[PDB]
Amino acid sequence: SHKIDIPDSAWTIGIGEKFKNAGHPNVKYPMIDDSYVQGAPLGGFGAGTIGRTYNGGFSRWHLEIGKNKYTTVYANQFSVQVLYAGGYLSSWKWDYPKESGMYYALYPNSWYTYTNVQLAVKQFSPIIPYNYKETSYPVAVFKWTAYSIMFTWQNMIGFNSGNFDSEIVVMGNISNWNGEYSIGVKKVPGKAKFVTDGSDLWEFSKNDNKDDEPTKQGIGSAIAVNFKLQPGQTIEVPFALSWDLPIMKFGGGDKWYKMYTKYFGKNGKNSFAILKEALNNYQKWEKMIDDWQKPILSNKSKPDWYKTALFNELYYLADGGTAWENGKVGETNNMFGLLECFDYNYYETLDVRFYGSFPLVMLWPDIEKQVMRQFADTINVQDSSEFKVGSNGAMAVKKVQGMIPHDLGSSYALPWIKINAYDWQNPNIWKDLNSKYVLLVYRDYVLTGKTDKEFLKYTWKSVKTALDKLKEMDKDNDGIPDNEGIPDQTYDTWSMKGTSAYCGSLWLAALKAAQEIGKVLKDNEAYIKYNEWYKIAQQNFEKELWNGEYYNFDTESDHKDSIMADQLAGQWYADILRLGDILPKDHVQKALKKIYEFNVMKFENGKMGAVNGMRPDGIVDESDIQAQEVWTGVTYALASFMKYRGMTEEAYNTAYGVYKMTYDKSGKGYWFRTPEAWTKDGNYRASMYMRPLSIWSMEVNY
């Protein structure tokens, strides 16, 4: 009751609190909306994860990789009266009282405090920067603190028929979807088979002791802690949950072992081995967590809201249907993938990770460079089977040689094997992907010391190919690839034509970045070529687009003089990659002030982020729905650029609107499901999105 840790910057909500302003999808096609009843997830990378919500319920199951089932498995609780703020199991005391406890989260930690004796728990999994071991585990620790505490848990094998010093006291299947869940507890100085009516386990209500050791049609266990509290006294018991579900399968066939198998084995009967390791070591884990968080949490110049966003946004690295493979079932690297989101069910969407992958480069760089090499490998893959383009019904080659793919597949097909699952447009003619690929490769070198010349060696052929193919898309001999007057980049319904601010700046930065790689690898043929291309392109970019107050959207559209939030995407990266000024400081500082004055300040009073497109007359551009959207990950990326350029006030005001909408009492209730986009009414599109992880680009220090 205020003895526990609980940092100031933790996101807080009353247990059982209703939220009367939650936004909904602003599109009519199929889209997830699990509502506002969410919490920080539990799970390592690749392990599948479990959303325990602020109401108590274990409600949001990503255990099946790449998929999202939202249902409260009501048998899973901690009971004192049951701690859940809300048919079967009728004998339990449900509707836990309101104005009677709180939830706090600062990912990877969260906490509950119950104050109707008074209790508090700290739940977390060992998500720790620069640690590729514990971070993989399918484990959660629940460190209770009292100043009768029972963990019940359903047998979720088949989510039925066929299911069974140190001091610590396992559900499964008769076969040898198969695996085990184990709960448990540890002895500090102080049942077995339920029917999921529930009077069987609920007595209990004063304070069975039965140890059964199989069914055919609602099994489930329970594990209690009994003690008397001498007044003034405060004890503490560590609980835990594990899940050995070692195989993931994807709609198309392939079955794979999860990453935690490397440490606990592929067998699927190692749940207790995992959960024990948890209960004997969580002390050392808390510490490792605190130690990485301290530098930011103690820098009292930064507002508490920005800490809240920064840390909790990390929920998605584990929660984005994340796949980390330790060999295929059947039979020297462990391939990795994060979903763009669950609605657009694509792994590693490259035009999005350009923004979204900052937490991996900065905090788990070995994973990052792995994913970049996966993209290196695909670049020359040719697949001439045709597909139907969703936007216009054109036929097109699936994968063209020398073109970076949009994605590396779908949980509904064959991740890592069948790439370009995306079909709304043809990514083989996108003008941003090949640029962005170069930029990511060089960023991943620069943000890891400038020492991994092996990484540059592996990717260098791909890099040179990527830009050689783009150069061929220059129709008008200006040295820049021409946008085709359809959406051929991440803004996949907003047409760009001729030369765009966006695709052009990325091409400038990509050419500069290849130049530097050129130097580092003693390759003067590529160095000279890219600098000659660079000088022609820069002169013309600048002539074509600079209008004296900002860079024009493009040279050839009817909306060519729209103010685009992301006009200087190239320069933003160039600052990060220490390539210096590909555009004049004066023009950049002018464009940034323009975007803040127009796209932020003239859109819902600067309280909702940066809308993508604004007309010179200060009215939102209506040429495309995307122009009328704030993209959370673009806004955050914009704030980082403003921060580096010394527009500090403007940076944080820009980024506050995203925080607010997401987390604040006056927002739209997107905590732990941050969407790609919202429109001016606050309604959203594509919750649980990769892009807004870009907030970590604000922590890039110089």
Q: Residues comprising the binding site?
A: 474, 476, 478, 480, 482
**Any contact of residue 305 with a copy of itself (CB under 8 A)?**
yes
Q: Give first-to-last CA distance, the chain, whole Å.
A: 41
And the tokens for 521? 């690898």
Residues numbered 339 to 358 that lie near a copy of itself (CB under 8 A) are none
Nearer to a copy of itself, 134 or 650 (CB): 650
Binding-site partner at residue 468 among a copy of itself, Ca ion, none, CB < 5 to 8 Å by type: none
User: What does 14 interact with, of Ca ion, a copy of itself, none (CB < 5 to 8 A by kind)?
Assistant: none
Residues 474 to 493 in contact with Ca ion, rule: CB under 5 A? 474, 476, 478, 480, 482
How many residues bind to a copy of itself according to rule CB under 8 A? 17
Which of a copy of itself, Ca ion, none does residue 386 bind (CB under 5 to 8 Å by kind)? Answer: none
The three-class DSSP label of residue 563 is strand
Asked if residue 302 binds a copy of itself (CB under 8 A), the reply is: yes
All residues at 6 or more sequence positions from 445 whose CB lies less than 8 Å from its CB, including other chains:
452, 455, 456, 517
Part in contact with a copy of itself (CB under 8 A); list of ranges 303-311, 490-498, 561-569, 623-631: 303-311
Rounded to a whole number of angstroms, the minimum distance from the CB of residue 39 to a copy of itself is 23
* C-alpha 354 chain-centroid distance: 13
Judged by phi (left if over 0) then psi (alpha if -120 to 50, else beta), residue 15 lies in: beta
* Residue reference for tokens 């993508």: 612
Contact 577, 532 (CB under 8 A): no
CB of 432 to Ca ion, least distance (A): 14
Closer Cβ to Ca ion, 111 or 507, answer by number? 507
> How would you class 168 by CB atoms within 10 Å of its CB: exposed for 0-12, middle for 13-18, buried for 19 or more?
middle
Give the Å distances, CA to CA, from 194 to 209, 218, 220. 12, 7, 5
Binding span for Ca ion by CB under 5 A among 137-145, 446-454, 467-475, 545-553 = 467-475
When the beta carbons of 13 and 150 are compared against a copy of itself, the nearer one is 13
304 binds a copy of itself (CB under 8 A): yes
Does residue number 343 form part of the binding site for Ca ion (CB under 5 A)?
Answer: no
Sheet architecture: strand order including 58-61: 41-42, 50-52, 58-61, 69-70
478: partner contacted, choices a copy of itself, Ca ion, none (Cβ within 5-8 A by kind): Ca ion
Total of chain residues touching Ca ion, rule CB under 5 A: 5
Angle formed by the axes of helices 304-312 and 271-297, to 10°? 150
656 φ, ψ (degrees, to nearest 5): -65, -40
Beta bridge partners of 611: 630
**Which residues in 639-668 contact a copy of itself (CB under 8 A)?**
648-649, 651-653, 655-656, 665
Q: Are strands 69-70 and 613-614 parallel, antiparallel or unpaired?
A: unpaired
- 476 near a copy of itself, rule: CB under 8 A: no
Rounded distance between C-alpha atoms, residue 394 and residue 426, angstroms = 9
Contact between 303 and a copy of itself (CB under 8 A)? yes
Q: Select from 357-365, 445-453, 472-480, 675-683 the region that touches Ca ion (CB under 5 A).
A: 472-480
> From a copy of itself, Ca ion, none, which one binds at residue 299 (CB under 5 to 8 Å depending on kind)?
a copy of itself
CA separation (Å) from 304 to 37, 69, 105, 314, 701? Answer: 23, 32, 13, 16, 19
Select from a copy of itself, Ca ion, none the partner in contact with residue 482, using the beta carbon and a kind-dependent cut-off of 5 to 8 Å: Ca ion
Instruction: Find the angle CA(78)-CA(242)-CA(181) to the nearest 5 degrees.
Output: 85
Query: Are the beta carbons of 86 and 55 closer than 8 angstroms?
Result: yes
Got the DSSP string for 546-575?
B-SSSB-SBSSSTTTT-EETTTTHHHHHHH
Residue in the block written with tokens 């099994």: 219
For position 332 contacting a copy of itself by CB under 8 A, the verdict is: no
CB-nearer residue toward a copy of itself: 83 or 642: 642
Per-residue binding letters, 282-301, with a copy of itself (x by CB under 8 A): ----------------xxxx
Torsions phi, psi of 51, nearest 5? -80, 105
Q: Is 451 one of the binding residues for a copy of itself (CB under 8 A)?
A: no
Residue 28 touches which of Ca ion, a copy of itself, none (Cβ within 5-8 Å per kind): none
Task: Map residues 246-285 to x or -, x wherever contact with a copy of itself holds by CB under 8 A.
Answer: ----------------------------------------
> Which of 205/648 has CB closer to a copy of itself?
648
CB of residue 104 to a copy of itself, shortest distance in Å: 15
Of 244 and 478, CB closest to Ca ion: 478
Task: Give the shortest CB-117-to-a copy of itself separation in angstroms.
Answer: 17
**Concatenated DSSP letters of 570-637:** HHHHHHHTT---SS-HHHHHHHHHHHIIIIITTSGGGSS--BSEE-TTSSB--SSTGGG-EEHHHHHH
Q: What are the two backbone dihedrals, phi and then psi, of residue 293, each rounded to the nearest 5 degrees? A: -75, -30
- The yes or no reply on residue 698 touching a copy of itself (CB under 8 A) is no
Closer to Ca ion at the Cβ: 83 or 480?
480
In the complex, least distance from residue 112 CB atom to a copy of itself, rounded to whole angstroms? 19
Q: Quote the CA–CA distance of 130 and 292 in Å, as a whole number.
A: 10
Binding residues for Ca(2+): 474, 476, 478, 480, 482
Shorter beta-carbon distance to a copy of itself: residue 526 or 651: 651
Least separation in angstroms between residue 560's CB and a copy of itself is: 33
CB 415 within 8 A of CB 67: no
Q: How far is CA 121 from CA 4, 114, 237, in A?
A: 8, 9, 9
Interface residue list for a copy of itself (CB under 8 A): 2, 298-305, 648-649, 651-653, 655-656, 665
Interface residue list for Ca ion (CB under 5 A): 474, 476, 478, 480, 482
